[PDB]
Chain length 211, copies 3
């Protein structure tokens, strides 16, 4: 399975589970993640979603090796959702979304933070938006609004790694945690939110995300 | 009197004065505060308003005990302004507004900071938005714009206390002061602003608040 | 010459060069700077512009002494661009713009930072917006968006000096540097950006500046 899903005290944890590929999103992982979010959106026993990665990476982003195979096959193939479908699930997700960035986040592995209501980042993790060394409309409205024009310029134009202290200093993530405290801290905050009525969490989220 | 009003060097200080009720806004205090702001807006001898609380609280927010009495009385009763009228006075106030948060700020006692041009907070004060354990459209546009999506999510969804260092780290307040330095620092900054021509203070405020 | 222009590794450095007048913009310097930006915008060998000042000042802002002479001459005279033309060149500049604030920045010498994609500031530099002791629509949308309502209120209403640590704390500048490290650090970051394809730098900038 490319995506592990587990419930605990009304927090649904999605753990990206292609650790050998640094949790790069192939089509199957894009599809699984997007579907997991729609399901979470609809499930009355889920208050909060927590997203994290298995192993040393958070997500290396789009799986470019699979993408090469797909464009060179006799017949092109796609997932039901793909990148485009994940962005729409993320953009419309009506419940609190918490990211626990456990290691490298590249491309969508970094820009996904624009849809997070809270982001915790391991002190050993780093982020990169590699667009200029190689983005979506949503990311480039959301990120500048979060970190300001200057921080966003460096993040999105440089293709340089951004470390945990820089990400926090930017306001790109909310808290830095030691590697071993990341999930305990993220989960503790998720459980505070998840104890609240789901209806009122959704109403607050909607009032702050509408513009 | 529920609201003390005093002028000194063209700064009008409004001191919420129900210290036994932690300066909870009953209808009479909502009315007095809203009226005090319209008057300040119109008074040519007032450049700046400084808002603070008497005693250990800044404001415990809407007086829920009075609200219970009102909804259980034979006849319902209201103030000329109430909550709704205070928000409109705050939203339209055309002069610099400085808040000196001297202690607990709950509900509107916290979200009122979205209308502040500067906010100073005592190092022993804490803030709470209790909506989810129990908001207005304005607060949830203004606050996210001030503190960013992630800080706003925690503030508005958690119903947890936010201490002085957290409020500053968020950008929810501008400066932290020791308890004894709060009013002297707030007043010193208010007097710098108040020495300027009122016309030009209003023009600058209007140019930065229009969108 | 009032403006020195030099190319090095696809970074074009504009060095304001009226050091005796603390790099105040007379009409000739407004015209030279605006023109230098249009040219840079069009030049395919320029990826990034770096703007800094010669001598102890970054820019003292509009040259008020020249302005007095102009309004008291028999015949009024103007530059092809002036203040108005510089703002339009700045607002439309489609490539990364980096400011290296080497000393005092007053009026437009401070508000020009609202158009910077990155701003580095010497630890001995200070900024001032003197409007109230004496602004444009763009500055007062851009600056509040960058530093938040409270920081913007102090910056734009107080007419007080803002030092390097305050400017950084506000988010008005991205990094503080020792005086001797300012240009080396600004240039190092400019060269990271400038190594990228110009087309993709412009596309990223446009996606983050459109709203």
């Amino acid at each position: 399975v490319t995506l592990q899903i587990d419930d605990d005290n009304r927090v649904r944890t999605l753990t990206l589970n292609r650790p050998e590929a640094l949790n790069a999103f192939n089509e199957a992982l894009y599809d699984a993640t997007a579907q997991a979010l729609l399901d979470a959106a609809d499930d009355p026993q889920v208050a909060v979603v927590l997203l994290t990665g298995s192993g040393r990476g958070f997500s290396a982003g789009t799986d470019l090796a699979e993408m090469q195979a797909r464009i060179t096959d006799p017949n092109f193939s796609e997932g039901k959702f793909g990148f485009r479908g994940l962005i729409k699930a993320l953009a419309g997700f009506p419940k609190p979304l918490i990211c626990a960035v456990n290691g490298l986040g590249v491309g969508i592995g970094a820009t996904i933070l624009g849809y997070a209501d809270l982001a915790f980042m391991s002190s050993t993790a780093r982020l990169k938006c590699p667009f200029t060394s190689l983005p979506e409309a949503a990311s480039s409205y959301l990120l500048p609004q979060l970190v300001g024009r200057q921080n966003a310029a460096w993040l999105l134009m440089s293709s340089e790694w951004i470390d945990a202290e820089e990400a926090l200093r930017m306001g790109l993530v909310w808290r830095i945690c030691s590697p071993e405290e990341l999930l305990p801290e993220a989960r503790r905050h998720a459980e505070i939110l998840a104890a609240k009525p789901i209806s009122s969490l959704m109403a607050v989220k909607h009032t702050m995300v509408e513009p």
